[PDB]
Amino acid sequence: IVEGSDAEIGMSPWQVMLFRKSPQELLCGASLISDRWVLTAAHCLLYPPWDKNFTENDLLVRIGKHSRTRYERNIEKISMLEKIYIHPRYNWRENLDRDIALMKLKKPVAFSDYIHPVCLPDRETAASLLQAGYKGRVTGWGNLKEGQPSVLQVVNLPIVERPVCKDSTRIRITDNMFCAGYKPDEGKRGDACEGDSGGPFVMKSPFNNRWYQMGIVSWGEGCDRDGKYGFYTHVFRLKKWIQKVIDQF
Amino acid sequence: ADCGLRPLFEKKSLEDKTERELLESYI
Amino acid sequence: XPXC
Ligand SMILES: *[C@@H]1O[C@H](CO)[C@@H](O)[C@H](O)[C@H]1NC(C)=O
Ligand SMILES: [Cl-]
Ligand code: NA
């Protein structure tokens, strides 16, 4: 997270760290959407042009964390994956269209002050809150500049108009994505970066005070460049797939 | 059922240091 | 490109 600040304890208790086993390393962020399902970006798990293709036993998730590196005993929970599901029409060849994946934990996790699921939006919540100029929040342990933080980082960023997102890049943007970040004329800065991919872009509903995961950190060109924006998987647009995976289990 | 309400924040009627920025962005 |  570029130009963000330290999260408070328990500020993002749905935050999940995706960790590679061998070698040990933070791969991506992710989020807890129930006691046994974790959402992340498909590209964190599958990206053939970089020879990336993880299987369940290659990975762990760490839930409840604040420190990037310290083992947080009695606070964090380390879970194994039973199954990974990647959107069948995830487009890794072209533009990361439908950049979304679900991971089922081998056993449900107990909730706590530090571990708690985020909501997914319904139709009304998406229609109401996903509007240009309204802000959401991105969190992660990714790079501080395009340099790793000691603890989880947070920054709030505005949703940007689709034509401005499209003007900003030659990559083909689809309705399964949205972009966010400040414009060059707004003075303020801030973006997700390498290592934050897969983590949540959330909004606190003004109608019911619940936090909803509206986006997943998906792609960007550099981090925090003037005239460039972060791009996010549009969770609500892909919700029927999410529900199909969860239901059918 | 209880999704999206944080134990150390909404459940304790406490607010975090920057959520006001999100609320104001709605108006 | 990809978040990475
Ligand atoms: C990813 O890895 C699995 C491992 O068996 C393989 O079956 C599959 O063909 C790979 N997927 C892609 C899209 O390359
Ligand atoms: Cl879908
Ligand atoms: Na920018």
Residue numbers in the entry:
A (entry chain H): 321 to 466, 475 to 577
B (entry chain L): 291 to 317
C (entry chain I): 1 to 4
The study reports:
All the inhibitors bind in a substrate-like orientation to the active site of the enzyme, forming an antiparallel β-sheet with the Ser214-Gly216 segment of α-thrombin. The P1′ Cys of fPrC establishes Van der Waals contacts with Trp60D and is hydrogen bonded to Gly193 N and Ser195 OG through its carbonyl oxygen. Its terminal amide nitrogen (N2) also establishes solvent-mediated interactions with Leu41 O, Cys58 O and Lys60F NZ. However, in the fPrC and fPrt complexes, the Ser195 side chain is rotated away from the catalytic histidine residue, therefore disrupting the canonical hydrogen bond, and interacts instead with the carbonyl oxygen of the P1′ residue. We suggest that the catalytic triad disruption in thrombin∶fPrC and thrombin∶fPrt impairs the enzyme's hydrolytic ability, as proton abstraction by His57 NE2 and activation of Ser195 OG is no longer possible. In the thrombin∶fPrt and thrombin∶fPrC complexes, the side chain of Lys60F is found in an extended conformation similar to that observed in the thrombin-PPACK model and in the unliganded enzyme. However, the presence of d-Arg at this position also results in the upstream residues sitting deeper in the S2 and S3 pockets, thereby increasing the distance between the Ser195 side chain hydroxyl and the P1 carbonyl carbon of the inhibitors (3.69 Å, 2.85 Å and 2.96 Å for fPrI, fPrC and fPrt, respectively). Of the three tetrapeptides, fPrC was found to be the least selective, displaying only 3- or 20-fold selectivity towards both factor Xa or trypsin, respectively.
